[PDB]
């Protein structure tokens, strides 16, 4: 009986949340930006072709200087590219060749890695010996790591396959905070520009925005009918876009506490692997499983460009901090850096 | 002109050296066989791993056999969603599936008429018909044959195989269950199942793996380049 009344209370609260959301919902984003001009056909052209990886590229992250990038491709290699001249500044061997995520520290001194080994490994770039070495091999997760990101040189937040997220202190090597509440395993994670709040998408078809300091889920968002594979923050920090296996991208808003827009097309049937916003936040790029990426308008939901340069699934997507180039990694073991003209 | 200074030229040299190292490491990795071990928890997977040879994830066991390095990955310690990481093993040389022949009677803790070995064949069907494993041969290791022989004298095989229409002898029972296991393959044109019964000495059941991997690498060599 107690479980029954608790379930009744739960569904009553869920219905109240839905009523509140539909109450604050008055006009659609498409209606509001109906009269604005739409961007022309985006004409990205491949500017660089980073080669050297020998297996499916699974992770890629841009450096803060917008010149150095880090890639992982499940061949036991962590390659750091100077994209301007197409050079390899480092090639970090991996203890476990099942990496699924990467992160470049904002200070540029450390590089994160992690995969099916349930372990987040930190690698020190700026060292006196001259060779990249492991600084702290974080452990404590009971599931594969799907996304890792840096807050600063001594703190990260890692999303893993044990349906939980964890904020780790690098120096102590301990989970200084643990975030729980997702029924299914989480697959993506992204921080706010001020690194105060962060969103995480899971196979539960829900995206939860957590607070780093207080340590509990501030908000939860639903709307997808399948697992959420990618999440990314708006440059403003008041909205975020999630891509899922149901072949749709969705733009959620923080303050509105509900869904805002849906980017989908009938010709699109495969799911989303990665998402990324443009510097101004108007262009939303999404990597797909049909071996090409799509560039939508974040305000009009009209497809603005297609990046067809890969012959395998596009698994990575990143936009430089200055919004200059766009890096795409795919399972064909090639990275492509695109730019406009 | 060259439009490159000394530091840029030295960086290019460093990148070329890194490229050479990556090429050599990739060649060494290609000169290697990769296997993925699957099956139920109570299927003797630890025993077969021991016969071939801190975190509950993917464990890698490496062993040599007549100049054929083997890397075998056991992912049985992963309790998350399989469909979210199984594609990471898309390029494996072969898949080793272990099924215990003595679990035809035993039922799992959640005993709801779903037999342990019924779940075993459901898992085998899911693995065999997976989109990522269209061209990946499966080595079917049938374990605990002696104890299955002991058990079949008393417990009939018709309890969990009602459609059985043969004698209750171990040989015919094993042949029939082998054909039933191979029946679930819906991609007979591309992949083939190499079924072997675990024996006392590790030599026989590592030699079976060596022969199977040799045959499959020959087949992919003959099929990748356009021949055959």
């Amino acid at each position, epitope marked *: 009986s107690e479980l029954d009344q608790l379930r009744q209370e739960a569904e009553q609260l869920k219905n109240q949340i839905r009523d509140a959301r539909k109450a604050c919902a008055d006009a659609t984003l498409s209606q509001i930006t109906n009269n604005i001009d739409p961007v022309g056909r985006i004409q990205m052209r491949t500017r660089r072709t980073l080669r050297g990886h020998l297996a499916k590229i699974y992770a890629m992250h841009w450096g803060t200087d917008s*010149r*150095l990038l880090v890639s992982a491709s499940q061949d036991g290699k962590l390659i750091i590219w*100077d994209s301007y*001249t197409t*050079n390899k*500044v*480092h090639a970090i061997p991996l203890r476990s060749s099942w990496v699924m995520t990467c992160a470049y520290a904002p200070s*540029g001194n450390y590089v994160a890695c992690g995969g099916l080994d349930n372990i987040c490994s930190i690698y020190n770039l*700026k060292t*006196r*010996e*001259g*060779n990249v070495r492991v600084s702290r091999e974080l452990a404590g997760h009971t599931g594969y790591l799907s996304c890792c990101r840096f807050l600063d040189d001594n703190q990260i937040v890692t999303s893993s396959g044990d349906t939980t997220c964890a904020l780790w202190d690098i120096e102590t090597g301990q989970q200084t905070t643990t975030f729980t509440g997702h029924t299914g395993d989480v697959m993506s994670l992204s921080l706010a520009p001020d690194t105060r709040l962060f969103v995480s998408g899971a196979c539960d078809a829900s995206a939860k925005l957590w607070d780093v300091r207080e340590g509990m889920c501030r908000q939860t968002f639903t709307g997808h009918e399948s697992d959420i594979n990618a999440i990314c923050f708006f440059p403003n920090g008041n909205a975020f876009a999630t891509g899922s296996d149901d072949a749709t991208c969705r733009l959620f808003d923080l303050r509105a506490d509900q869904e805002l827009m849906t980017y989908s097309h009938d010709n699109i049937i495969c799911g989303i692997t990665s998402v990324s916003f443009s510097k101004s936040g108007r262009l939303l790029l999404a990597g797909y499983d049909d071996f090409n990426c799509n560039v939508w308008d974040a305000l009009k939901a009209d497809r603005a460009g297609v990046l067809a340069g890969h012959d395998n699934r596009v698994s990575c997507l990143g936009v430089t901090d200055d919004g200059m180039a766009v890096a795409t990694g795919s399972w064909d073991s090639f990275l492509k850096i695109w730019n406009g003209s | 002109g060259c*439009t490159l*200074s*000394a*530091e*840029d*030229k*030295a*960086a290019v*040299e*460093r990148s070329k*050296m890194i490229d050479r190292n990556l090429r050599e490491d990739g060649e060494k990795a290609a000169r290697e066989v990769k296997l993925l071990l699957l099956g139920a928890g109570e299927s003797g997977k630890s025993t077969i791993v021991k016969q071939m040879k801190k975190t509950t994830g993917i464990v890698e066991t490496h062993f040599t056999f007549k100049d054929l390095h083997f890397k075998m990955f056991d992912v049985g310690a992963q309790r998350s969603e399989r469909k979210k990481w199984i594609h990471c093993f898309e390029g494996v040389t072969a898949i080793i599936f272990c099924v215990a022949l003595s679990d035809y009677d035993l039922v799992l803790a959640e005993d709801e008429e779903m037999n342990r070995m019924h779940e075993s064949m459901k898992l085998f069907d899911s693995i065999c018909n997976n989109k990522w494993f269209t061209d990946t041969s499966i080595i079917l290791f049938l374990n605990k044959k002696d104890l299955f022989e002991e058990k079949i004298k008393k417990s009939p095989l018709t309890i969990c195989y009602p459609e059985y229409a043969g004698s209750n002898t171990y040989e015919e029972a094993a042949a029939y269950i082998q054909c039933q296991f191979e029946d679930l393959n819906k991609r007979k044109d591309t992949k083939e199942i190499y079924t072997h019964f675990t024996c006392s000495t590790d030599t026989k059941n590592v030699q079976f793996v060596f022969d199977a991997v040799t045959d499959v690498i020959i087949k992919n060599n003959l099929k990748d380049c356009g021949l055959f």
Partner: single-chain antibody
Amino acid sequence: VQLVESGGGLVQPGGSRKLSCSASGFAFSSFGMHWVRQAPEKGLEWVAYISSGSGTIYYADTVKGRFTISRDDPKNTLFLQMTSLRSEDTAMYYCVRSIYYYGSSPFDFWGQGTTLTVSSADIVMTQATSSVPVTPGESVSISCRSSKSLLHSNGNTYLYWFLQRPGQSPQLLIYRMSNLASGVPDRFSGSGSGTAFTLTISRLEAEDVGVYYCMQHLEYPLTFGAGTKLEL
């Protein structure tokens, strides 16, 4: 990180010697290793250069042909054979490590060097001042000049500032005219655009006295300067 050298001594002119450097504490095989010389009471002078993997080998004009540089990476050693030693070869020889990638700090570490006693070009770097008297707590400026603009087309200036304390091996202060080498106080700073470069020492104190050297890294016939001696 530690570089030690051996093989110096007295040599009759026309002889031969093999100086050796025994690197330790770092990845030697991934470092390009140089050779510098310093005539007694004189400025520095680049002698030779070998890249990682022995790819490109460069020699100074005055020693080309006589000097043969080589390295044994498995044993972490670097040898410099000399043939037909002349009386102009009497100098303190230092061995310098240097890696090259984006954001790297070449010439960061210098060995202690060994003493040897014998019985056209481009980028002539001139430092007008030679001896400057200083007082602790004050701010000083050091100026150097180059024959041609050091600002390459990639936006990088290739001017390096080194400091040699009295009776000690030189250490790297500033690389690429603006970046501070790791392990030095933040009071140092560099300036200049194409030809005239300035080192600005704010709140100078002891342990900072000694000679200061400017260096170019555009054309591999690397040229130092006379160096300015800050004396108390």
